[PDB]
Amino acid sequence: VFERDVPDYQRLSYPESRLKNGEISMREFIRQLAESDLYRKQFYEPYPNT
Amino acid sequence: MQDAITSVINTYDVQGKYFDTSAFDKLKAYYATGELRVRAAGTISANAATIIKEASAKLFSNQPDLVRPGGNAYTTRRYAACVRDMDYFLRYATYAMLAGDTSILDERVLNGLKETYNSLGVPISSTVQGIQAMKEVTGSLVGSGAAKEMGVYFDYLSSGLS
Amino acid sequence: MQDAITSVINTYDVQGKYFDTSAFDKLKAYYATGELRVRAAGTISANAATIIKEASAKLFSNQPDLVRPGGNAYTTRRYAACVRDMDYFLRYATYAMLAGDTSILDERVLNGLKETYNSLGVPISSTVQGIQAMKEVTGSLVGSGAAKEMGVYFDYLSSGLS
Amino acid sequence: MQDAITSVINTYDVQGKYFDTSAFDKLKAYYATGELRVRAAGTISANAATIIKEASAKLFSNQPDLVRPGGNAYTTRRYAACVRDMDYFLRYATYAMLAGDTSILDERVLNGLKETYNSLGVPISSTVQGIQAMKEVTGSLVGSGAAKEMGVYFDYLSSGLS
Amino acid sequence: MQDAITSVINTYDVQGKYFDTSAFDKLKAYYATGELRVRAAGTISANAATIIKEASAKLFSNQPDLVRPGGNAYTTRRYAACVRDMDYFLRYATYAMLAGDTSILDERVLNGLKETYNSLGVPISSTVQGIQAMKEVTGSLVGSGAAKEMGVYFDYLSSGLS
Amino acid sequence: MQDAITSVINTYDVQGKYFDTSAFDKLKAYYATGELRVRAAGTISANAATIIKEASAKLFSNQPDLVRPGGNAYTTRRYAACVRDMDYFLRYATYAMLAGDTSILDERVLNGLKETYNSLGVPISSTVQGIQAMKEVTGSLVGSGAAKEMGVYFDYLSSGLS
Amino acid sequence: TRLFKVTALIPSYKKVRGGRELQNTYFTKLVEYDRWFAEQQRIQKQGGKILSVKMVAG
Amino acid sequence: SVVTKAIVSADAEARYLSPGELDRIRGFVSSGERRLRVAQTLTESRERIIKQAGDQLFQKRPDLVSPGGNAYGAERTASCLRDLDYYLRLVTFGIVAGDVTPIEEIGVIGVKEMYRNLEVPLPGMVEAVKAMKSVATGLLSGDDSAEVGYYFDYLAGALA
Amino acid sequence: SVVTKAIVSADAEARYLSPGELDRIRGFVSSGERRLRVAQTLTESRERIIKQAGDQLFQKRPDLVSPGGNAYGAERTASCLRDLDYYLRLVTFGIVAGDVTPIEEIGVIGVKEMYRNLEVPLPGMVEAVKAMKSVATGLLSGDDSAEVGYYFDYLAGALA
Amino acid sequence: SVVTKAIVSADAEARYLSPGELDRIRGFVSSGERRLRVAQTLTESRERIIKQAGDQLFQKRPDLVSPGGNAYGAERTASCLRDLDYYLRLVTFGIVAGDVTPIEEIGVIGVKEMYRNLEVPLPGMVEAVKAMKSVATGLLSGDDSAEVGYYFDYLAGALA
Amino acid sequence: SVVTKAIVSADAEARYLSPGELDRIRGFVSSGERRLRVAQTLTESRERIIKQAGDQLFQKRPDLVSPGGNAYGAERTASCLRDLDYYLRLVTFGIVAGDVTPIEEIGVIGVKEMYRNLEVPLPGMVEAVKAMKSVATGLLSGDDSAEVGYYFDYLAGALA
């Protein structure tokens, strides 16, 4: 989702705990990663909508 | 994106300098304009629909063939795409005015837009005319002081497309 | 996409005109051949596997280097991709014949196909020869009256690729 | 989540009434403690890593078998998960203190937590010990009034576990 | 989902037998009712928004507490959820009428709706009243022959939701 | 999943103990059987199709009603799903036989399988008998030594379904 | 409102999947309130049957 | 179109057309002459349909041409009747195509946004479309009126 | 069926059926009598169809009944003919349905895997289906013969 | 509220509130008394606001209370005034909250569909919100008038 | 800055800035003169702050300056003081921007990788930052002292 390794200080710990607990699936993990501020910062803010 | 403060910080960081008297002057100027910018932003948000209403009305009055059969704004889909584009232009010009900088218009709007319209067949000159109409409508609502500053960013978009 | 009906409709829509005598003549012309089109489409649908087998056999006989070691169809993977592509051409030619229009061939087959095959390394001339073999095999099954209409779209594919 | 203001709003919205004198009294009570809450939150944010270090050090000092082989916090993975959980408790207690309401604790922390720890084998008693350790370290750091407010949400977490 | 035709097919396929005269008679019955089912579906679709208008107006006239502060339909959000649920019930009931079978109501409406409503606290009695209101409003438009058939699926929805 | 070696490692890590004579004997035993396990896995993988065919034929000869109409394996789709489940069981039994552990059978096979079959309508007893048929067919090929080991995991799957 | 916890079974009807696909067939998951209508519609249109709905939070 | 929609459906599944799709194309091309006659009938009397439907619309909804209404004035009323002429032409296109795909492409995608941007009430649009439906099915036999009303009802539902 | 496919397409867009889909259902139900006549004719003559088709298949492919063949022996030949009967019944089912759907759920999805597990040569299946097509088409009238041949052609293409 | 937005934003990134967010909360809680007295003065005079706003709305757009209008009659006019009362209450909630989230969850999300099912025209609502803005800003100090006017502007923009 | 965060938050949701965000921007620009006073104060005492902080650092950790240390020599101790100058400049940038974005993106993201690559002890960085915090806050007024302390506290937490 982020096109390269993300350092530990930027990884989202709450989704990861949710995922290894089985509360959410990989699809919901990917959704959490997409909806984070890191994604908006890297792949929405510097680009046009198209 | 960069706003005015970010731009000053950048121009002083790339040369390793602390802020000078000129930097603090620019920062005071932006903070002084802040209240006017906020008032204009609130007014435009309250009246975004109306601004698009009248801007599109007068653009299609000056260029009737756009909405008539054979024009690029002739079908409900293409007309809706056109007013959606005008919505983009108004919202991002308001962002740029509130920021005091034109960088958001560069990155989020103008980057590749001529390519997009060329591939779509959208007439760019008529889009510039729509932006000019939007300028005319917005300047009435925001008042002269805010009209000058907001017309700065409308003219930035018009110059970037033309 | 477009068919004969949709083509006539878009022609009259871009002028903002109601249907005229010539329009109704064209619509009748399509309705008259719709029965033959359905019959031929069912014929190809029934015999598509046989058509692909015989056309691929003819093509790989005429150009044995295509499937000898170092050929572009030499691996089970690339041979499968080759016969799969021939099946795609047959299916889309049947769609075009049923629609009475070559627009679907442009928009859904031919657009960006030369660039794709050039980046892959697929020999375009051999692909055209495969399409011609498909034409020859299909013509015998469908029957001459349907074969002419089918050959229109087969030759359209060959010319667009050539 | 909801805060004190939002809770009063929801009460009066379900009741359908405008704000009364009692609602304004509650809002004044919450607004009066805003600077205290903000000071406590800032002090905790500055000192969060410290607080976690002393709290976990005391917890593992009293229950040393938790991090020796056979205990629940024995591995680097398990120890890291323990300190991560303690940091969660501190951060969400701070959120609740700022909001003046315990709803975020239920919605985002406690719902499912007890059976999660019960299925994993995480001891509830030791977790409560760690939460009280964080409570007393934080209370030493934040002063008397801020500690009195903070203990409410620490106790809420503890009692929501059991 | 299965319609009447697929219902007969499944009944005769599980037994492993070819069609009998009984199966042919059921199929003839469905083909006989098909034309009136299509007319009823068209009439309902032409009037769907109007039916939801009147049915929700009746449901809130008989129970004004539903849309007042404290009611399950009190907000713009919950009112919209209510009317959207009514609209989905109408469209799926029309599907089941046109198919001659209640299987689509089981598969795509009542599949999980009872549990969702129970968890949310949606008044089951009031939902049944709303469905009854739709039944009444639709019966006026479709006519007695079509209304008797539409009542089957409205009653099925009310029974499953009860 | 978990290996026999990983099993000993965990049993000694939770004790915080180095390997002793007992652990070294267990590791020696697994290392000694490793070559036999690899031979059996190779033979099974080579003959997986033949085992599935013989076992499915034996199962559907003992229970012909399963593939006649009204049986749970009456359709090409349900018959395919049946043989697919048998392939699952064989492949995972081979994984577990190679691992010398039944952990993978719990984690990736039986976890929610009984309830899934219950909701689907699958006869658990007949699936168990198909597993038994795989047991005998596989034991015929792999040989006397590997048959008992492989039947250990077949019996594990049979009991986990039971 | 807030989260639902939904348990559903989605059978396969268009083909037979060579992958294990058990985790794609019977599963329990937490859905946000604002997503549950669309998720329930998707489960229904895939031919899946919803075992149970609960309201965890809220 | 019928053939267009069948081809698109078969393409999404990467397959040739099924016997059912071929059968419905067969039925559509069997019905071509009747559809063309209906379209000619609606075309030859387009001015009468538009004028009569405008009269019924402005009688039932006089607020539109009242002061403050969107149809108020000569030019706004002319543009109103021009919109009605548009939708009649799209109905004829739909009749010849055998489906509502042309009507979707030309006058259903984005109608709510467009008429919002035009201060055009959508209930008024629905009432005008119903007026055209009545006037147009009046000039037709029952078998033709059923399908023509079906297209007009599609328009009304899309605008509603 | 035709009705089920139309409903599923319309529900994929959360919409009521279009005029085209309604016309499709109307044309389907107007044809139910002819379809039931065809299904009746195929059901009454099922045993002649199966016997003559099996005879044709074994005449053209003696290897299937020779020693070492998949259909060698009385029991295997009986299972072969029973499969042919299955597919004839499925063809009748699809005929009354108006589409190849019931054929698809009952006898096409996973068919290649099942005949793979049973050592049944799929070319033998295709040729047996072609034999059934010829026999059945020899019985019906030409107009119905083409429609029935379409379902047999779908089956033979699915087995290939 | 401002507090809820700050906490939610910090929680999304799994972090404590930054000095900027704490500054925002400081500025919000430092203005709590002013917002409280503004909400007090709107609440104590709600009857005057609703009456004068209804008068202005029906004067600017009489078609609503003209026959055939959506608000024709004392019952529908009372429902209109009750809706305006709702929105004044939500504006007071938004004033005390420091943001427009109570207004959003209670009376903006779903307002389009609700008012379409009521046949209420959205331009009428927007003009009624302007009338309420004028009446309410009439009886507050200049800064207080600006503060209430911002929320009324948001409500008008959301209604359109 | 604060304005940039408000704008990106609005833009990610395709909306104009809400009254709360505009109120936040209003409060930010109404505090600008105070922020510039504080930043100019920190700029005047650049050299005092850096030299005092270096003294406090080097008395607490003599081994860093002692032979074999990370900062031993005029060049490496000058690099140390240069890093302190970097971070004080960043603090002034954050003061004017009203938030810690300039600090986080010029000096926090990747700082651990930087100082692992440079073999600089991170506790040394942390307590050098605490030394700068003490020295700088000794110079500011108590109100300004708290504000500057927030940014220094954030930086100290960020290094750890």
Ligand SMILES: CCC1=C(C)/C(=C/C2=NC(=C\c3[nH]c(/C=C4\NC(=O)[C@H](C)[C@H]4CC)c(C)c3CCC(=O)O)/C(CCC(=O)O)=C2C)NC1=O
């Ligand atoms: C922000 C809301 C939130 C909370 C509260 C939360 C707690 C939480 N802790 C977990 C595991 C754990 N939690 C602990 C902590 C325990 N070890 C004991 O010694 C201590 C007494 C005690 C902590 C003080 C441990 C060791 C595990 C790992 C268990 C395992 O890996 O099997 C898990 C399961 C998945 C994982 O490893 O992360 C959750 C969900 N997660 C969340 O997203």
Ligand SMILES: CCC1=C(C)/C(=C/C2=NC(=C\c3[nH]c(/C=C4\NC(=O)[C@H](C)[C@H]4CC)c(C)c3CCC(=O)O)/C(CCC(=O)O)=C2C)NC1=O
């Ligand atoms: C946020 C920055 C941004 C912009 C501005 C943008 C423009 C944009 N305009 C588009 C289409 C369009 N745009 C227009 C507008 C033109 N037609 C008339 O001639 C007018 C003169 C003129 C508008 C004033 C039209 C008619 C289309 C439809 C084109 C087509 O479908 O062929 C599309 C293709 C997607 C769609 O159809 O909605 C984009 C991406 N994209 C972006 O990411």
Ligand SMILES: CCC1=C(C)/C(=C/C2=NC(=C\c3[nH]c(/C=C4\NC(=O)[C@H](C)[C@H]4CC)c(C)c3CCC(=O)O)/C(CCC(=O)O)=C2C)NC1=O
């Ligand atoms: C290395 C990857 C690769 C393979 C394997 C491959 C095989 C291959 N075998 C072919 C023909 C053939 N292959 C066979 C083999 C069959 N005869 C009996 O049935 C046996 C069961 C079976 C062999 C044991 C036969 C008889 C033909 C001739 C087909 C014909 O003349 O119609 C062809 C068609 C073109 C040609 O004949 O040159 C290919 C491409 N191609 C590849 O790129």
Ligand SMILES: CCC1=C(C)/C(=C/C2=NC(=C\c3[nH]c(/C=C4\NC(=O)[C@H](C)[C@H]4CC)c(C)c3CCC(=O)O)/C(CCC(=O)O)=C2C)NC1=O
């Ligand atoms: C099997 C996985 C595992 C590991 C490795 C582990 C390490 C570990 N070391 C600890 C303490 C410690 N560990 C060290 C070791 C450090 N001192 C020097 O700096 C050296 C560089 C370095 C060792 C070479 C020291 C000095 C302490 C005492 C800290 C204290 O007293 O506060 C603790 C705290 C609780 C306790 O002392 O029992 C743990 C959990 N725990 C685990 O579950």
Ligand SMILES: CCC1=C(C)/C(=C/C2=NC(=C\c3[nH]c(/C=C4\NC(=O)[C@H](C)[C@H]4CC)c(C)c3CCC(=O)O)/C(CCC(=O)O)=C2C)NC1=O
């Ligand atoms: C708290 C948020 C909330 C709102 C806003 C809300 C509005 C609302 N207004 C209603 C009625 C109504 N509302 C109006 C108001 C309109 N009349 C004119 O056109 C004006 C432009 C406009 C008012 C300014 C009218 C006329 C009715 C009566 C409709 C009827 O009975 O046909 C109804 C139906 C229940 C009833 O009959 O009283 C609702 C749900 N409900 C809510 O839960």
Ligand SMILES: CCC1=C(C)/C(=C/C2=NC(=C\c3[nH]c(/C=C4\NC(=O)[C@H](C)[C@H]4CC)c(C)c3CCC(=O)O)/C(CCC(=O)O)=C2C)NC1=O
């Ligand atoms: C296509 C089949 C299907 C349906 C119909 C369906 C309905 C449905 N209604 C819901 C909520 C709701 N449903 C209603 C409607 C009811 N409450 C009112 O009082 C009325 C008496 C009554 C309607 C006549 C309301 C008010 C809510 C909001 C409940 C809440 O927010 O707490 C929800 C929760 C999620 C959401 O609204 O986004 C669903 C899934 N779901 C489905 O998969």
Ligand SMILES: CCC1=C(C)/C(=C/C2=NC(=C\c3[nH]c(/C=C4\NC(=O)[C@H](C)[C@H]4CC)c(C)c3CCC(=O)O)/C(CCC(=O)O)=C2C)NC1=O
């Ligand atoms: C890797 C571990 C694993 C297993 C074991 C597994 C079993 C499994 N079997 C299924 C269906 C099925 N399974 C069977 C097989 C049974 N019915 C017959 O009568 C026999 C008695 C018996 C086999 C010997 C059948 C017939 C179905 C079709 C059920 C239906 O869709 O109607 C399904 C539903 C999805 C699908 O249809 O493909 C699953 C998940 N899935 C897994 O991921």
Ligand SMILES: CCC1=C(C)/C(=C/C2=NC(=C\c3[nH]c(/C=C4\NC(=O)[C@H](C)[C@H]4CC)c(C)c3CCC(=O)O)/C(CCC(=O)O)=C2C)NC1=O
């Ligand atoms: C082919 C698809 C298509 C359609 C349908 C279409 C409609 C359309 N109608 C317009 C104006 C208009 N349309 C109407 C019609 C309304 N008057 C009353 O309110 C009625 C409720 C309603 C008609 C029954 C009116 C009054 C105007 C004038 C708006 C103005 O001048 O402010 C405009 C703006 C440009 C112009 O004046 O020509 C368009 C684009 N355009 C298209 O490309």
Ligand SMILES: CCC1=C(C)/C(=C/C2=NC(=C\c3[nH]c(/C=C4\NC(=O)[C@H](C)[C@H]4CC)c(C)c3CCC(=O)O)/C(CCC(=O)O)=C2C)NC1=O
């Ligand atoms: C309605 C869906 C359906 C179908 C179609 C179906 C086919 C089917 N045919 C079978 C047997 C068989 N089927 C055949 C047929 C072959 N013999 C020749 O090779 C020919 C090419 C060909 C027939 C024309 C044969 C020979 C067997 C016996 C194979 C054996 O048991 O060893 C079996 C194994 C169980 C049994 O003996 O009944 C199935 C499942 N099952 C279904 O549930």
